[PDB]
Amino acid sequence: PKDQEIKKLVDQNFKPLLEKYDVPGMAVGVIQNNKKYEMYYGLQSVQDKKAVNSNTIFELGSVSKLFTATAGGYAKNKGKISFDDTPGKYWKELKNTPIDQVNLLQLATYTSGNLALQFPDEVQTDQQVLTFFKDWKPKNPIGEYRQYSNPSIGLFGKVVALSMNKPFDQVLEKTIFPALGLKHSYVNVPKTQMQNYAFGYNQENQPIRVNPGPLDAPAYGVKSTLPDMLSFIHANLNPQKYPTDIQRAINETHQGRYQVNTMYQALGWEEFSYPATLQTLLDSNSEQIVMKPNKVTAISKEPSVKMYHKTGSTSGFGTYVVFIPKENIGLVMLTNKRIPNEERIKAAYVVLNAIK
């Protein structure tokens, strides 16, 4: 059976990474032709002696940005925002400031020109975040240079929230997650689910969870189970099978906005021409693309067959999601220890290419 063939493939390619990087726990999911396969290894909690299972909640880290993107696509297609609007229109305390000449799409796709990977260490309180954006001044020409930025998509998320007259946590938990059919996906894990919330483990194998941070939720703050992430990949593979509002939201996240070498930047998702070589997928995670600013080029020819992926990490967790529309296949990897991005991409590449 397919069940045993997939289990064997994941056992050969993913299971060895547990001994190699000393990973307490892992969840790997495959969806093929609307059939879900769930593999669980090791411990959700070392001290509590809890096995990883279908209820285990993991930190998605930067894979959170896919839900922020989906929320933006939902708001835009319900006419709550336009991608040509500026933050001042919704956050009135930023009206007539320099950041108010950056549009929402530029914030969402990291092209503000002067927003780094992280906020400064001193930015913490709601007031210090508002001050940081009021005191913001341009550097590189607005819209020309991609620099991967938590603050950038953070502000986009806050604006999307204001546009729908809810806090961001409520936008996901009350609108987007239910619309996608996600039952155990959280910005804030409730008291009744804390026994299902995995500990992350650092490079010394000490337990750690993600700390509150300035505009954390939209950038890296979402937690989910393997079954919920498999449902999210199913939605991305079959957006036609969902209500108009969320279908339009999903399709909005799949549209390439600009290009950097072999990579097309969509809303949240990273987009590639399919078939993609292993090295094209590894290049997306290169220090050059991730750490440093890069000149963006216009889309000349939109690739006819596309493929999408996203890596994510916190101090304690690793995440990788990938889906190929034309093959009706996708994969999710969740670990409660950071492993190198290259090892996640390579393992996923072998499994997806080998599946019949």
Ligand X SMILES: *C(=O)[C@@H](NC(=O)/C(=N\OC(C)(C)C(=O)O)c1csc(N)n1)[C@@H]1N=C(C(=O)O)C(=C)CS1
Pairing of strands 329-335, 318-324: antiparallel
Query: Does residue 265 belong to the site contacting ligand X (CB under 6 A)?
Result: no
Q: Which stretch, 24-32, 119-127, 268-276, 313-321, contacts ligand X (CB under 6 A)?
A: 313-321
User: Which of 148, 186, 197, 264 is an active site residue?
Assistant: 148
Quick one: CA dihedral 209, 217, 93, 174, positive or negative? negative
Q: How far apart are CA 55 and CA 224, in angstroms?
A: 9
Give the Cα separation of 296 and 257 in Å (integer).
10
Tell me the closest approach of the beta carbon of residue 313 to ligand X, in angstroms.
Answer: 3
Q: How far is the CB of 112 from ligand X (least distance, A)?
A: 16
The span from the CA of 344 to the CA of 336, in Å, is 13
Q: Is 339 in the site for ligand X (CB under 6 A)?
A: no
Site string for ligand X, 55-94 (x = CB under 6 A): ------xx--------------------------------
Q: Looking at 21-29, 166-174, 236-244, 311-319, which segment touches ligand X (CB under 6 A)?
A: 311-319
Residue 284 touches ligand X, criterion: CB under 6 A: no
Is 256 among the residues that bind ligand X (CB under 6 A)? no
Question: Which one from 37, 41, 45, 62 is the annotated catalytic residue?
Answer: 62
Quick one: which segment of 222-230, 293-301, 306-314, 321-329 binds ligand X (CB under 6 A)?
306-314
Q: Which is nearer to ligand X, 37 or 186 (CB)?
A: 186
**150 binding ligand X? (CB under 6 A):** yes
We find the least distance from the C-beta atom of residue 319 to ligand X, in angstroms, to be 7
62 in catalytic set: yes
Q: Which long-range contacts (CB under 8 A, 24 or more apart) does 193-197 make?
A: 193/57, 195/50, 196/44, 196/55, 196/56, 196/57, 196/225, 197/57, 197/223
Among 117, 278, 305, 354, which residue interacts with ligand X (rule: CB under 6 A)? Answer: 117
- Asked whether the bond before 275 is cis by omega within 30 degrees of 0, the reply is yes
Segment contacting ligand X (CB under 6 A): 25-33, 89-97, 250-258, 308-316? 308-316
Q: Judged by CB under 6 A, does residue 312 bind ligand X?
A: yes
Give, as ranges, the residues between 215 and 254 that touch ligand X (CB under 6 A): 220
Per CB under 6 A, which region of 95-103, 154-162, 300-308, 310-318 contacts ligand X? Answer: 310-318
Q: Determine the length of the chain.
A: 356
Q: How far, in Å, CA of 209 to CA of 51, rounded?
A: 18
Strand, coil or helix: what is 126?
A: helix
> For ligand X, how many residues bind (rule: CB under 6 A)?
13
Residue among 86, 311, 335, 336 that touches ligand X (CB under 6 A): 311
SS3 assignment, position 255: coil
Active site residue 313: no
DSSP assignment string, 151-219: HHHHHHHHHHHHHTTS-HHHIIIIIIHHHHT-SS-BSS--GGGGGGBPPEE-TT--EE-PPP-TT-HHH
- Please select the residue that binds ligand X; options are 106, 152, 314, 336, rule is CB under 6 A: 314
Closest to ligand X by CB, 282 or 299: 282
The residue with tokens 């690793």 is 318
Three-class DSSP category at 259: strand
- When CB distances to ligand X are compared, the closest residue is 62
**For the chain, how are helix, strand and coil distributed in percent, rounded to 5?**
40, 20, 40
Q: Tell me how far apart the alpha carbons of residues 227 and 11 are, in angstroms, rounded to a whole number.
A: 19
Asked if 289 touches ligand X (CB under 6 A), the answer is no
Q: Is residue 313 a contact residue for ligand X (CB under 6 A)?
A: yes
Task: From 25, 85, 79, select the one nearest 51 (Cα to Cα).
Answer: 25
List 46, 282, 290, 350, residue binding ligand X (CB under 6 A): 290
Contact call for residue 293 and ligand X (CB under 6 A): no
> Which positions lie near ligand X, rule CB under 6 A?
61-62, 117, 150, 210, 220, 290, 311-315, 341
Q: Which residues are catalytic?
A: 62, 148
